[PDB]
Symmetry: C5
Subunit: 45 residues, 5 copies
């Protein structure tokens, strides 16, 4: 049978997961920047 | 026809890896978020 | 139905997503690098 | 088959790169978890 | 309009982008590891 439709589906699923990855990474950078600033203001340092 | 069978296989393996990457990132941001909270409550700071 | 047109759009979307992922990772490495150096010169250490 | 052979090779290269990204991320999570436990079990905090 | 040529270019771009991601990730793991060790040798803890 024709595997093109399934190939398109795999690509669509790839983009779905990749979009989730982008959102996670985006949040993570925010958490890391917050961690950085907090450490910068650590009196012990 | 064409290398459709082979290309599909590469796409499926890629999706499987991306899904794992997604879950790894998910867990990672969690750990970072915990680390962040632990530092915010660190009396040394 | 020729699916090439749709597949191409998926590939383009993938690259756009990756461009964002790369930019985010680039900024994240900079934050971590700064966090590293800050902890390195921490008084209480 | 036209550019099919070349496209398949790009896909294989992509899967190889992803495997490496996965292994790197798996190592990174372990370092973050250790870091998390370290700060969590810190005395000064 | 034959889209294969353009599809090949997108795939090659995905690999170029992924190589950049892998490069950034390996450097990031190094920075995170340095951070981990630095905290481990931090007297304050
Ligand atoms: C035609 C085939 C599809 C091509 C899609 C390629 C898959 C995209 C790979 C995405 C890799 C991103 C990994 C996350 C980056 C690491 C973030 C972190 O530091 O935690």
């Amino acid at each position: 049978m024709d595997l093109a439709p399934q190939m398109l589906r795999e690509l669509q699923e790839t983009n779905a997961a990749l979009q989730d990855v982008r959102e996670l990474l985006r949040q993570q950078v925010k958490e890391i920047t917050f961690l950085k600033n907090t450490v910068m203001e650590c009196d012990a340092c």
